[PDB]
Amino acid sequence: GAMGSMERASLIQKAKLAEQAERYEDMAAFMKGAVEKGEELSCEERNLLSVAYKNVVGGQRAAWRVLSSIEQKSNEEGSEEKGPEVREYREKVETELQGVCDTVLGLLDSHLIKEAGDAESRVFYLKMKGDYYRYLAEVATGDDKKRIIDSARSAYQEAMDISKKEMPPTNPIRLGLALNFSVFHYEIANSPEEAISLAKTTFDEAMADLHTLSEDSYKDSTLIMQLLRDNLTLWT
């Protein structure tokens, strides 16, 4: 790897600089280098890894959706034939997106998840595994769509089981996991009723636990609860 000669601490320092400069591709490459040093990641380092790749893949997903929409319109009756270029370029962006997801999944498999023993790290990484399989599922159309969807579901489910046993209902990792699993149910798994039920139960159980929290934790938890409510408003 091109980051093999850089100190772990220097990679983390530069990831933070890249974040300030909104250079998320650089940030992701620095954090990949840090993961590949082989040591476990602290809470802050996990957040840096997540921010970096979320921004990279977010740009790719937005571009893929623009290109896919143009492609679909070109395949409607009455549409003038424009050649293979739209499909080719959508395929190019799709392949790069798949590459980023495979990179993240590879870091989780080698060897972040297997070394993660605490609930906060293990749930975080399993949620990420669900998220990146979900992004693969958004573009999947072939013989492996079902298996990609099941891989996402499985990762989310293991994360949910741990989070329910080991974390309070207001924990932001638990809340963000439930939010994203609910989106999986609505957008990927054709299960809007499961999505609504999960969002509602997650919101209500967090509400009942807010009284235990400090002002700062209260602000963290209620911010994510508002996202659950925003989805429930969209879905109902």
Partner: peptide
Amino acid sequence: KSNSISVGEFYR
């Protein structure tokens, strides 16, 4: 689009 969240982005 439904709202999702990155835990790192939320904290960072």
